[PDB]
Coordinates of all heavy atoms in Angstrom, one line a residue:
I180 N 1.7 31.7 -152.7 CA 1.6 32.5 -153.9 C 0.5 33.6 -153.7 O -0.3 33.5 -152.8 CB 1.3 31.7 -155.1 CG1 -0.1 31.1 -155.0 CG2 2.4 30.6 -155.3 CD1 -0.5 30.4 -156.3
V181 N 0.6 34.6 -154.6 CA -0.3 35.7 -154.6 C -1.3 35.4 -155.7 O -1.0 35.4 -156.9 CB 0.3 37.0 -154.9 CG1 -0.7 38.2 -154.9 CG2 1.3 37.3 -153.8
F182 N -2.5 35.0 -155.3 CA -3.6 34.7 -156.3 C -4.0 36.0 -157.0 O -3.8 37.1 -156.5 CB -4.8 34.1 -155.6 CG -4.7 32.7 -155.3 CD1 -3.7 32.2 -154.5 CD2 -5.6 31.8 -155.9 CE1 -3.6 30.8 -154.3 CE2 -5.5 30.4 -155.6 CZ -4.5 29.9 -154.8
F183 N -4.6 35.9 -158.2 CA -5.2 37.0 -158.8 C -6.3 37.5 -157.8 O -7.0 36.8 -157.2 CB -5.9 36.6 -160.1 CG -4.9 36.3 -161.2 CD1 -3.9 35.3 -161.1 CD2 -4.9 37.0 -162.4 CE1 -3.1 35.0 -162.2 CE2 -4.0 36.8 -163.4 CZ -3.1 35.8 -163.3
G184 N -6.3 38.9 -157.7 CA -7.2 39.5 -156.8 C -6.7 39.7 -155.4 O -7.4 40.2 -154.5
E185 N -5.4 39.2 -155.1 CA -4.8 39.5 -153.8 C -3.8 40.6 -154.0 O -3.2 40.9 -155.1 CB -4.1 38.3 -153.3 CG -5.0 37.2 -152.9 CD -4.2 36.1 -152.1 OE1 -3.5 35.3 -152.7 OE2 -4.4 36.1 -150.8
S186 N -3.6 41.3 -152.9 CA -2.6 42.4 -152.9 C -1.2 41.8 -152.9 O -0.9 40.7 -152.4 CB -2.8 43.3 -151.7 OG -2.7 42.5 -150.5
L187 N -0.2 42.6 -153.4 CA 1.1 42.1 -153.4 C 1.8 42.3 -152.1 O 1.3 43.1 -151.3 CB 1.9 43.0 -154.5 CG 1.9 42.3 -155.9 CD1 0.5 42.2 -156.4 CD2 2.8 43.1 -156.8
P188 N 2.8 41.7 -151.8 CA 3.5 41.8 -150.5 C 4.0 43.2 -150.3 O 4.5 43.9 -151.2 CB 4.6 40.7 -150.5 CG 4.9 40.5 -152.0 CD 3.5 40.6 -152.6
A189 N 4.1 43.5 -149.0 CA 4.7 44.8 -148.6 C 6.1 45.0 -149.2 O 6.5 46.1 -149.5 CB 4.7 45.0 -147.1
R190 N 6.8 43.9 -149.2 CA 8.2 43.9 -149.6 C 8.3 44.4 -151.1 O 9.2 45.1 -151.4 CB 8.8 42.5 -149.6 CG 10.2 42.4 -150.2 CD 10.7 41.0 -150.1 NE 12.1 40.9 -150.7 CZ 13.2 41.4 -150.1 NH1 13.1 42.0 -148.9 NH2 14.3 41.3 -150.7
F191 N 7.3 44.1 -151.9 CA 7.3 44.6 -153.2 C 7.4 46.1 -153.3 O 8.1 46.7 -154.0 CB 6.0 44.1 -154.0 CG 5.9 44.6 -155.4 CD1 6.4 44.0 -156.4 CD2 5.1 45.7 -155.6 CE1 6.2 44.5 -157.7 CE2 4.9 46.3 -156.8 CZ 5.5 45.6 -157.9
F192 N 6.5 46.7 -152.5 CA 6.4 48.2 -152.5 C 7.6 48.8 -151.8 O 8.1 49.8 -152.3 CB 5.1 48.6 -151.9 CG 3.9 48.1 -152.7 CD1 3.3 47.0 -152.3 CD2 3.5 48.7 -153.9 CE1 2.2 46.4 -153.0 CE2 2.5 48.1 -154.7 CZ 1.9 47.0 -154.2
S193 N 8.0 48.2 -150.7 CA 9.2 48.8 -150.0 C 10.5 48.7 -150.8 O 11.2 49.7 -151.0 CB 9.4 48.0 -148.7 OG 9.9 46.7 -148.9
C194 N 10.7 47.5 -151.5 CA 11.8 47.4 -152.3 C 11.7 48.3 -153.5 O 12.7 48.9 -154.0 CB 12.0 46.0 -152.7 SG 12.6 44.9 -151.4
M195 N 10.5 48.4 -154.2 CA 10.4 49.2 -155.3 C 10.8 50.7 -155.0 O 11.5 51.3 -155.7 CB 8.9 49.2 -155.8 CG 8.6 50.0 -157.0 SD 6.8 50.2 -157.3 CE 6.4 51.3 -155.9
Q196 N 10.3 51.1 -153.9 CA 10.5 52.5 -153.5 C 12.0 52.8 -153.3 O 12.5 53.9 -153.7 CB 9.8 52.8 -152.1 CG 8.2 52.8 -152.3 CD 7.5 52.4 -151.1 OE1 8.0 52.3 -150.0 NE2 6.1 52.2 -151.3
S197 N 12.7 51.8 -152.8 CA 14.2 52.1 -152.6 C 15.0 51.8 -153.9 O 15.9 52.5 -154.3 CB 14.7 51.2 -151.4 OG 16.1 51.4 -151.2
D198 N 14.7 50.6 -154.5 CA 15.5 50.1 -155.5 C 15.6 51.0 -156.8 O 16.6 51.2 -157.4 CB 15.1 48.7 -155.9 CG 15.3 47.7 -154.9 OD1 16.0 47.9 -153.9 OD2 14.7 46.6 -155.1
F199 N 14.4 51.5 -157.2 CA 14.3 52.2 -158.4 C 15.0 53.6 -158.3 O 15.2 54.2 -159.4 CB 12.9 52.2 -159.0 CG 12.6 50.9 -159.5 CD1 12.2 49.9 -158.7 CD2 12.7 50.7 -160.9 CE1 11.9 48.6 -159.2 CE2 12.5 49.4 -161.4 CZ 12.1 48.4 -160.6
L200 N 15.3 54.1 -157.1 CA 16.2 55.2 -157.0 C 17.6 54.9 -157.4 O 18.4 55.8 -157.7 CB 16.2 55.8 -155.6 CG 14.8 56.0 -155.1 CD1 14.9 56.5 -153.6 CD2 14.1 57.1 -155.9
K201 N 18.0 53.6 -157.4 CA 19.4 53.2 -157.4 C 19.8 52.4 -158.7 O 20.9 52.1 -158.8 CB 19.6 52.3 -156.2 CG 19.3 53.0 -154.9 CD 19.3 52.0 -153.8 CE 19.0 52.7 -152.4 NZ 17.9 53.6 -152.4
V202 N 18.8 52.2 -159.5 CA 19.0 51.3 -160.6 C 19.8 51.9 -161.7 O 19.4 53.0 -162.2 CB 17.7 50.7 -161.1 CG1 16.8 51.8 -161.6 CG2 17.9 49.7 -162.1
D203 N 20.8 51.2 -162.3 CA 21.5 51.7 -163.4 C 21.1 50.9 -164.7 O 21.5 51.4 -165.8 CB 23.0 51.4 -163.2 CG 23.5 52.3 -162.0 OD1 23.2 53.5 -162.0 OD2 24.2 51.7 -161.2
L204 N 20.5 49.8 -164.5 CA 20.1 49.0 -165.7 C 18.9 48.2 -165.3 O 19.0 47.5 -164.2 CB 21.2 48.1 -166.2 CG 20.9 47.1 -167.3 CD1 20.6 47.9 -168.6 CD2 22.0 46.1 -167.5
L205 N 17.9 48.2 -166.1 CA 16.7 47.3 -165.9 C 16.8 46.3 -166.9 O 16.9 46.6 -168.1 CB 15.5 48.2 -166.1 CG 14.2 47.5 -165.6 CD1 14.2 47.3 -164.1 CD2 13.1 48.4 -166.0
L206 N 16.8 45.0 -166.5 CA 16.9 43.9 -167.4 C 15.6 43.1 -167.2 O 15.3 42.6 -166.2 CB 18.0 43.0 -167.0 CG 18.3 41.7 -167.7 CD1 18.3 41.9 -169.2 CD2 19.5 41.0 -167.2
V207 N 14.8 43.1 -168.3 CA 13.4 42.6 -168.2 C 13.4 41.4 -169.1 O 13.8 41.5 -170.3 CB 12.5 43.6 -168.8 CG1 11.1 43.1 -168.7 CG2 12.5 45.0 -168.0
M208 N 13.1 40.3 -168.6 CA 13.2 39.0 -169.3 C 12.0 38.1 -169.1 O 11.6 37.9 -168.0 CB 14.5 38.3 -168.8 CG 15.7 39.1 -168.8 SD 17.2 38.3 -168.5 CE 17.1 38.1 -166.7
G209 N 11.5 37.6 -170.2 CA 10.5 36.6 -170.1 C 9.2 37.0 -169.5 O 8.7 36.2 -168.7
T210 N 8.7 38.2 -169.9 CA 7.5 38.6 -169.3 C 6.7 39.4 -170.3 O 7.4 40.2 -171.1 CB 7.6 39.3 -168.0 OG1 6.3 39.8 -167.6 CG2 8.6 40.5 -168.0
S211 N 5.5 39.3 -170.4 CA 4.6 40.0 -171.3 C 4.3 41.4 -170.7 O 3.7 42.2 -171.4 CB 3.4 39.2 -171.6 OG 2.6 39.1 -170.5
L212 N 4.6 41.6 -169.4 CA 4.3 42.9 -168.8 C 2.9 43.3 -168.9 O 2.6 44.4 -169.3 CB 5.3 44.0 -169.4 CG 6.7 43.8 -169.1 CD1 7.5 44.8 -169.9 CD2 7.0 43.8 -167.6
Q213 N 2.0 42.3 -168.7 CA 0.6 42.5 -168.7 C 0.0 42.7 -167.3 O -1.0 43.3 -167.2 CB -0.1 41.4 -169.4 CG 0.2 41.2 -170.9 CD -0.3 39.9 -171.4 OE1 -1.0 39.1 -170.7 NE2 -0.1 39.7 -172.7

């Protein structure tokens, strides 16, 4: 797991960079987005 105060995995940023160019629908579920 990624503890508070740790950096997120490279995969998070690599996927974010590619995926959000391609997304047609964002489905956000069960999170306070804090």
Side-chain angles (χ1 to χ4, degrees):
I180 67 173
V181 180
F182 278 63
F183 287 63
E185 287 194 285
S186 56
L187 273 63
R190 175 178 181 76
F191 174 89
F192 301 97
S193 70
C194 289
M195 180 194 69
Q196 291 152 9
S197 178
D198 289 345
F199 286 80
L200 306 177
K201 301 166 178 51
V202 59
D203 297 311
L204 175 65
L205 193 66
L206 176 52
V207 182
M208 305 188 287
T210 173
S211 64
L212 296 173
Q213 295 169 0

